[PDB]
Design a protein around this nucleic acid. Structure first.
Ligand SMILES: [Mg+2]
Ligand SMILES: [Mg+2]
Ligand SMILES: [Mg+2]
Ligand SMILES: [Mg+2]
Ligand SMILES: [Mg+2]
Ligand SMILES: [Mg+2]
Ligand SMILES: [Mg+2]
Ligand SMILES: [Mg+2]
Ligand SMILES: [Mg+2]
Ligand SMILES: [Mg+2]
Ligand SMILES: [Mg+2]
Ligand SMILES: [Mg+2]
Ligand SMILES: [Mg+2]
Ligand SMILES: [Mg+2]
Ligand SMILES: [Mg+2]
Ligand SMILES: [Mg+2]
Ligand SMILES: [Mg+2]
Ligand SMILES: [Mg+2]
Ligand SMILES: [Mg+2]
Ligand SMILES: [Mg+2]
Ligand SMILES: [Mg+2]
Ligand SMILES: [Mg+2]
Ligand SMILES: [Mg+2]
Ligand SMILES: [Mg+2]
Ligand SMILES: [Mg+2]
Ligand SMILES: [Mg+2]
Ligand SMILES: [Mg+2]
Ligand SMILES: [Mg+2]
Ligand SMILES: [Mg+2]
Ligand SMILES: [Mg+2]
Ligand SMILES: [Mg+2]
Ligand SMILES: [Mg+2]
Ligand SMILES: [Mg+2]
Ligand SMILES: [Mg+2]
Ligand SMILES: [Mg+2]
Ligand SMILES: [Mg+2]
Ligand SMILES: [Mg+2]
Ligand SMILES: [Mg+2]
Ligand SMILES: [Mg+2]
Ligand SMILES: [Mg+2]
Ligand SMILES: [Mg+2]
Ligand SMILES: [Mg+2]
Ligand SMILES: [Mg+2]
Ligand SMILES: [Mg+2]
Ligand SMILES: [Mg+2]
Ligand SMILES: [Mg+2]
Ligand SMILES: [Mg+2]
Ligand SMILES: [Mg+2]
Ligand SMILES: [Zn+2]
Lengths: 120, 91, 69, 114, 50
RNA sequence: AGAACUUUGAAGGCCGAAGUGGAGAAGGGUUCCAUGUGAACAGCAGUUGAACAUGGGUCAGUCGGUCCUGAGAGAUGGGCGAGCGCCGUUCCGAAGGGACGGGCGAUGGCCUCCGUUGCCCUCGGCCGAUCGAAAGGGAGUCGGGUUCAGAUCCCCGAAUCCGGAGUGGCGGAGAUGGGCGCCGCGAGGCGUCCAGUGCGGUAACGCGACCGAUCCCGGAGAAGCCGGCGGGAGCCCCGGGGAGAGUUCUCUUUUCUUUGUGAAGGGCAGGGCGCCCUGGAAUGGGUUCGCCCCGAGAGAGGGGCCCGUGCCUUGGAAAGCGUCGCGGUUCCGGCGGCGUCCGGUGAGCUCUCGCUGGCCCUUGAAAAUCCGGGGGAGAGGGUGUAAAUCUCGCGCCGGGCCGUACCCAUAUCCGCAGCAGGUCUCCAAGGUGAACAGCCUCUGGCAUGUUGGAACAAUGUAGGUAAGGGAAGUCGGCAAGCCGGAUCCGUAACUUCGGGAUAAGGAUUGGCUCUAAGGGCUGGCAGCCGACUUAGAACUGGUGCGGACCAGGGGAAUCCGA
RNA sequence: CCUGGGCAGGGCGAAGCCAGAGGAAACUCUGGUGGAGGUCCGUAGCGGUCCUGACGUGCAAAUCGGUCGUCCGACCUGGG
C-alpha cells in the first residue's frame, strides 16, 4: 500500500485507463472553484490590508475575480502589477500637468499683484 | 449567458404538462418568486410566506397580500372604493 | 471535586468539623492533600516539601491521616 | 475500529436518544448520553427575532438550579425584552401620554373659547 | 386546509383585566401592528368590522 | 467401551464492517449457567445439544414504566330506548370543597411565644371526571473491578437531582452610614436626629445573595424536508521515539498491536450574534461556494453576551494498559522496575454544533412542568440594637412499587419442524475503486447449513466454449451473446424548443522515467513546509492495456396510453 | 389520523448572480457561479416483466436463480 501510494504521489498508475469515474466525480468542479477563488480572494486581502492595492481597485478586481477572468495567482499578481504601473504613470502625468497649471496660476496671481502695485 | 430562450423558470419542469400550461404558470411563478418593494421599511425584502401571506425581511412587519402577487388589481380597486365611500359625504 | 488554592483556607477546612478523611499523596514533583468532608473532595496541591512538612505538623491531631503508599 | 453499543434499551435513533462518544480512563471508547440543547428565551411578540442576551440557555427544569443572576438582566423588563423593546416602549409611552395631554389641553382651550 | 390567511387580533376586555385573543379572517392589505377597530360607530376602513 | 461429527494444537478456507460480528424493541418463558445420564428426542451419531434429572441465576433516587397529553376512547348532567343498554363530551348542568387576607370563638405545645379547629366576609371560566406512547414531552451516574450465570443496579471511588426544616442547624448578604453638641493631645468614647428591602459599567451587561400576594403578560417545553459551507470529536493516513512479536535464501533504521483520562466545578482556546459605543460613506463600499448588508448606519477601532461535547487543572494514577522479574498449594480487585511520548495533513467517512438558502393552493402537534417580567396590596427592627427575606456557600435526613437472565435468529419469534419464507433498529476498519457497488484482507465469528465413503454411465439442474454460415429454427431474436467504465472529437429526423442524447459513429487507455501548472507560513523582493489532481513528452512489452471485478446493443417505423 | 425511523455514488444543469463583447436604444452573444426536478443510470429498501428456468408428495398450502421496474418521492416502514 505504501509503495503504491508513493507511486501515485510521484504520478504513476494514474493514467486514462485506470480512471473509472468522471472528472467531476474525481475532483469536483465546485471544490476546484472554491479553492481557486478563496486563494484569489484572500491574496487581495493580504495586498489591501498591507500596502499594495487601494480601496477602489480592490472592489473592481474583486468582482473581476468573482467573474471567471483570472485563472491563477501568477496572472492575478501580474495583472495587479500592470494596473499598479498604469496608475503610477497616470498619476505621474497628472502631477506634471497639475504642477504646470499651479505654477501658471501662481505666476498669474503674482503678475496681478505686480499690476496692482504699479497702479497703487 | 442566456441558456433558456422560451421556458425561463419553467425549465425545471422540462418536457411535461403542455406549452400553454407552462406559459401560464411562468408569469405567476415569477410573481411568487419576485422580491417586492416593502412599503414600510422602503427595502426590497418582501419574501413570500405561505399563500396569502407576504413577509418583509427587515422590520418583520407581516402583511396579508394576494395569493401570487403583492397587490391584486381587484384589491386595489376595492381599496380605492373603500376610501371613496369613506370620504363620500361623511358616511 | 474542588481545588483549594490557598493554605489558610485548606487548614480552615481541616479545622472544620464533619470531615472524616485526609489523604496525603506524594508525587514526583509536588504533593497533594485530600479532605473528604461531606460529598465533596477538597484538594490542596503544593510543590514545597518544607511547606508540606509544616502543614503535616500543623494538621489537627483529632483527625485520621492516610499516606498513599 | 472498535464498534460500540447502546447502553440503554432505546434501540431507535430518536430525539431523546441524542448521544456522543467519549473515552474512558480505562482506554475504551464509551457511548455517552447527551442532554438535548436548550435555547435562550426570546423577546415579547413582535420585534425582530433573536434570543435575549445574558440568560443561561438551559432547560426549564434546569431553571430551578439557575439562580437569580443568570436568568434575567438587571434592567426593567430584564428577561423579557431585548432592551430595544424597552428603549422603544419608554419613548412610545412618553410621547403618547404627552400627546394626550396636548389634546386634552387643546380641548380645554376649546371649552374656554366656546 | 385553508388558502385564506388567518389573523390573530388581540383585544382588551373592558370588564376584567385580561387581554383576550381572537382569530379573524385576514382581510386584504392588513399588516401586523395595524389598529383593527371593531364596533358600531367604527370608521369605515379595511379591516374594521362594523 | 466405542470418534467422519466432542474438545484442544496446527494447517487450509468462508462470512469481509449494507457480516455467518457486538447489542436492543415485539415475541418466547428458563431456553441463561454448572454438574451427571445417553432408552426417548436431534430425521446417521454423539463422549454432544436449545433433550433429560439435580442445583443456581435477574439487586436501581439519577435505565425504563409510573407523570403528561396526541389521534382517539370514555362516565356523570341530559336525551333516546320494550330492554341488556345506546347517543354525546360541552352540549339542555346549582358540574370549584380551594385560597392571600381580616374579624369572632375555642382547643393544644415551653398558653410569653406559636401551632391547630369552626363561622362570616373577600378572591378564584372548567375550555370539564378519567384513560390513552417501554420510539413523543419528561429534572438528575459516571470511571474501574467482580461471577460458571449480574451490571450505569453489586464492591471501591468520584458526583448530581427532587422533597424536609417547627424551639425557625452554621456562616454570608439585608449590616451597619451621615450630620450636630460634649469630653479627650490624638486615636476614640458619650447624647440626640436622620437614612439604609445591594452595587458597578455611558452602554450591550456583570457579581456570592438582592422582600414580594391575589392578578396579568411573555418565553421555554414546541418543531417539516432538501441543498450548500464552517468549527469540534471519533475512526483512517503520514513522519519520529518507546515496549513486545513476525521474516532474514538476499535486501529491508523493515512489518504487525498498543501508546489513556468519565460525570461534575474553574480557567483558556474555538465557533456564533438580527448585541452596544465612537464614527459617517458616493470615485460607492464590505464580505459568500452561492448569496447577501449598508443613512432604519457600511468599512474601521473598542466592547458585551451565548455554546464551549475541544485543551489544562481537583477527580487522575493510588486505579487501567503494555513489557520484564519476584513471592504465596491456595485465599490477596498480590509485590517491584520502566513506559504509557512529539508533530503534520485532509474534495477523507460517521456523529454533532452553528450560519445561510431553496421548496409549499403541503406551513409541518398538544399537554404536564418550570422560569422571567409588569404591577406594590402587604411585612419588617427602628438603632449604637438587630430584623422581615435569601433563587448564595455549607451541613443533616429520605427517595416507596414494578421490569432487569438469555435468543433477538439460515437453531430460543411466527409459519404443525433446528423449514432457501417473514419480522423493527444502533455501531461500522484496510486496499483497488466515484461509490455503504463488486473482489481480496483485519477485529470478531463459522464448519458449508437435518449425512459420510467409492466411481465419474444415460438423463437432468447450474456454468463455459466451439471451425464455416449468421435467425435459414421458431407463432415470434425465447434464451444466450455483442456495446458496456473513463478522457477527447462529433452528434440526425422531429419537437411543447425543455428535449431527443450516454443519439448514432470514431481514437486513446498498461508499465517505467521525466517536464509544466494549480498553495500555505515567516521580512523590512527572500527563506522553510507539505495535498492529490490535470496536461504533455520519451522509452518499453508477443497490439497488450476498464486486462479480474464493476457494466446501456443500436437504428427506422405503426397502434395504444400524455 | 397521531407519533417515531430510513433512503451509497454518479449524469442532465432551471431561476437567480458575476465578468467580458456588441448596440443609439430595446436588448442580444460568450465564459463562469448556482443546484432546480412528481429528472436519468444505479445500491440498500419496495414490488414482481421474462426465462412461461428450478422445484411442482418442493425450502415453501406461492419459494428460489438470473434477468428485472422504481429509488426525494403520488417513497418505504414500526407502534398507538
Ligand atoms: Mg456546477
Ligand atoms: Mg421516551
Ligand atoms: Mg482466504
Ligand atoms: Mg447483523
Ligand atoms: Mg456430559
Ligand atoms: Mg439421530
Ligand atoms: Mg444452554
Ligand atoms: Mg427441560
Ligand atoms: Mg448507589
Ligand atoms: Mg426514570
Ligand atoms: Mg358512550
Ligand atoms: Mg343517566
Ligand atoms: Mg396517563
Ligand atoms: Mg449479561
Ligand atoms: Mg462497568
Ligand atoms: Mg435541596
Ligand atoms: Mg461536516
Ligand atoms: Mg477535526
Ligand atoms: Mg468537563
Ligand atoms: Mg440483558
Ligand atoms: Mg429460517
Ligand atoms: Mg407450514
Ligand atoms: Mg430470512
Ligand atoms: Mg475502504
Ligand atoms: Mg481511493
Ligand atoms: Mg453506515
Ligand atoms: Mg439449519
Ligand atoms: Mg437441505
Ligand atoms: Mg456431515
Ligand atoms: Mg460457431
Ligand atoms: Mg465461428
Ligand atoms: Mg453477420
Ligand atoms: Mg435477412
Ligand atoms: Mg411465423
Ligand atoms: Mg432476452
Ligand atoms: Mg462469445
Ligand atoms: Mg431515441
Ligand atoms: Mg432502463
Ligand atoms: Mg401509462
Ligand atoms: Mg424520478
Ligand atoms: Mg432515456
Ligand atoms: Mg434493483
Ligand atoms: Mg412477489
Ligand atoms: Mg420472483
Ligand atoms: Mg415456470
Ligand atoms: Mg420434479
Ligand atoms: Mg436494474
Ligand atoms: Mg430511475
Ligand atoms: Zn419592511
Amino acid at each position: 500500500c505504501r509503495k503504491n501510494t508513493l507511486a501515485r504521489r510521484k504520478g504513476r498508475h494514474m493514467g486514462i485507463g485506470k480512471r473509472k469515474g468522471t472528472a467531476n466525480a474525481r475532483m469536483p468542479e465546485k471544490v476546484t472553484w472554491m479553492r481557486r477563488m478563496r486563494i484569489l480572494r484572500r491574496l487581495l486581502r493580504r495586498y489591501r490590508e498591507s500596502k499594495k492595492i487601494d480601496r477602489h481597485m480592490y472592489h473592481s478586481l474583486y468582482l473581476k475575480v468573482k467573474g471567471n477572468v483570472f485563472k491563477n495567482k501568477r496572472i492575478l499578481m501580474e495583472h495587479i502589477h500592470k494596473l499598479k504601473a498604469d496608475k503610477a504613470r497616470k498619476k505621474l502625468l497628472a502631477d506634471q500637468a497639475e504642477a504646470r497649471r499651479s505654477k501658471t496660476k501662481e505666476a498669474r496671481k503674482r503678475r496681478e499683484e505686480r499690476l496692482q502695485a504699479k497702479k497703487e | 449567458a442566456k441558456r433558456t430562450k422560451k421556458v425561463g423558470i419553467v425549465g425545471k419542469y422540462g418536457t411535461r404538462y403542455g406549452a400553454s400550461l407552462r406559459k401560464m404558470v411562468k408569469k405567476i411563478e415569477i410573481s411568487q418568486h419576485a422580491k417586492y418593494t416593502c412599503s414600510f421599511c422602503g427595502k426590497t425584502k418582501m419574501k413570500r410566506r405561505a399563500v396569502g401571506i407576504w413577509h418583509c425581511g427587515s422590520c418583520m412587519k407581516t402583511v396579508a397580500g394576494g395569493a401570487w402577487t403583492y397587490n391584486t388589481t381587484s384589491a386595489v380597486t376595492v381599496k380605492s372604493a373603500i376610501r371613496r365611500l369613506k370620504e363620500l359625504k361623511d358616511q | 471535586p474542588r481545588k483549594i488554592e490557598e493554605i489558610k483556607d485548606f487548614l480552615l477546612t481541616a479545622r472544620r468539623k464533619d470531615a472524616k478523611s485526609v489523604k496525603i499523596k506524594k508525587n514526583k514533583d509536588n504533593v497533594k492533600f485530600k479532605v473528604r468532608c461531606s460529598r465533596y473532595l477538597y484538594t490542596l496541591v503544593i510543590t514545597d516539601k518544607e511547606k508540606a512538612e509544616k502543614l503535616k505538623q500543623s494538621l489537627p491531631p483529632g483527625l485520621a491521616v492516610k499516606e498513599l503508599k | 475500529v472498535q464498534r460500540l453499543t447502546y447502553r440503554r434499551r432505546l434501540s431507535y435513533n430518536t430525539a431523546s436518544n441524542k448521544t456522543r462518544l467519549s473515552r474512558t480512563p480505562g482506554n475504551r471508547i464509551v457511548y455517552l448520553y447527551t442532554k438535548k440543547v436548550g435555547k435562550a428565551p426570546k423577546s415579547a411578540c413582535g420585534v425582530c427575532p433573536g434570543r435575549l442576551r445574558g440568560v443561561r440557555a438551559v432547560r426549564p427544569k434546569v431553571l430551578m438550579r439557575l439562580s437569580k443572576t443568570k436568568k434575567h438582566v438587571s434592567r426593567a423588563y430584564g428577561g423579557s425584552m431585548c432592551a430595544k423593546c424597552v428603549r422603544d416602549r419608554i419613548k412610545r409611552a412618553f410621547l403618547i401620554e404627552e400627546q394626550k395631554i396636548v389634546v386634552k389641553v387643546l380641548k380645554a382651550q376649546a371649552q374656554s373659547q366656546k | 386546509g385553508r388558502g385564506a390567511p388567518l389573523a390573530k387580533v388581540v383585544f382588551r376586555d373592558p370588564y376584567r383585566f385580561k387581554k383576550r385573543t381572537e382569530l379573524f379572517i385576514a382581510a386584504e392589505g392588513i399588516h401586523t401592528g395595524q389598529f383593527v377597530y371593531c364596533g358600531k360607530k367604527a370608521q369605515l376602513n379595511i379591516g374594521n368590522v362594523l
